Amino acid sequence: ILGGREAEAHARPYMASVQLNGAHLCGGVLVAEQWVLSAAHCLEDAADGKVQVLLGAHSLSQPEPSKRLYDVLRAVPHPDSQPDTIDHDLLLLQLSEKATLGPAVRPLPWQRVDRDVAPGTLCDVAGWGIVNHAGRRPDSLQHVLLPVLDRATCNRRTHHDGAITERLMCAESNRRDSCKGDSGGPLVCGGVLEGVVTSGSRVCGNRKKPGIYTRVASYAAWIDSVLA
Ligand SMILES: CC(C)[C@H](Nc1nc(Nc2cccc(CN)c2)c2ccccc2n1)C(=O)O
């Protein structure tokens, strides 16, 4: 997260750290008892590395009563995802057992109504991604509030030049933004999961290259199918 602040420990009990070989790789969001939603590009190149999900965490390094590392029974990228496209960038991780719930571990309700958020809606994005241009990695969860940017602005030739489909949404990226290590994480608007961070457009903090987020509601039937 660029331009953000340290999040209140455990105040987003849905937040997950997707880990590769014991290091944070991507964000994710607990959406069901046994399933975490993240981005397909996160595992594009993971090959047979050890993929785990850390729930209940604020600090990546320090012990906390609610922090538990889960193994992954199955990783389900969206079948239409591809390296080098921006579209369909969702991944569902089935934990090896149901998560133990509590005040610091809870699934986030997610948007099934397929309609756009109002322009400027202030949505919350959190993550353990880099926090400056040098690439510093924070130990603890960071977050920023970002206003939703209407799709027409986002599709201007000066911006993303027509690449924002109805299944994607944007948020402003003026210095405050999601960044590397934040993909897969949640864009939460009005207390409900609306979007998943994507890296499809990799630059961070350039206002003319808004954040892109995958609209969960657009993929409701796919999420439901895989969950069940
Ligand atoms: C592992 C994922 C596929 C993803 N990769 C990734 N993402 C970058 N950027 C990025 C990530 C999330 C969000 C956005 C834009 N708002 C921009 C980035 C930038 C510079 C060089 C390599 C970069 N690798 C990530 O780390 O989330």
DSSP letters spanning 21-38: TTEEEEEEEE-SSSEEEE
41 given a catalytic annotation: yes
Q: Which atom of ligand 1 is nearest to the CA of 210?
A: 16
* Beta strands 91-95; 68-77: pairing state: antiparallel
Nearest CA to ligand 1 atom 8: 180
Residues 191 and 189: their CA atoms lie apart, in Å, by 5
183 given a catalytic annotation: yes
| Residue among 99, 77, 135 at smallest CA distance from 15 | 99
- In CATH terms, are 1-12+108-217 and 13-107+218-228 the same topology? yes
89 given a catalytic annotation: yes
Q: Is residue 180 within 6 Å of ligand 1 at its C-beta?
A: yes
* Phi, psi at 152, each rounded to 5°: -60, -40
Nearest CA to ligand 1 atom 1: 42
Q: Compute, in angstroms, the gap from residue 84 CA to the centroid of ligand 1.
A: 12
Q: Is residue 197 within 6 Å of ligand 1 at its C-beta?
A: yes
The token duo for 72 is: 């992954």
Residues 141 and 104: their CA atoms lie apart, in Å, by 13
Taken in order 11, 32, 75, 123, is the CA torsion positive or negative? negative
Give Dmax over CA atoms of the chain in angstroms.
49
- Domain 1-12+108-217: CATH superfamily, name plus number: Trypsin-like serine proteases (2.40.10.10)
Query: Which ranges constitute the DSSP H helices of 76-163?
Result: 151-154
Q: Is 2.40.10.10 the CATH number for 13-107+218-228?
A: yes
Which DSSP letter does residue 113 get?
S
Contact 127, 141 (CB under 8 A): yes
The token duo for 45 is: 């190149």
Which DSSP letter does residue 136 get?
P
Q: Is residue 194 within 6 Å of ligand 1 at its C-beta?
A: no
Sequence spans of domains, the chain: 1-12+108-217, 13-107+218-228
Solved by what technique? X-ray
Which DSSP letter does residue 218 get?
G
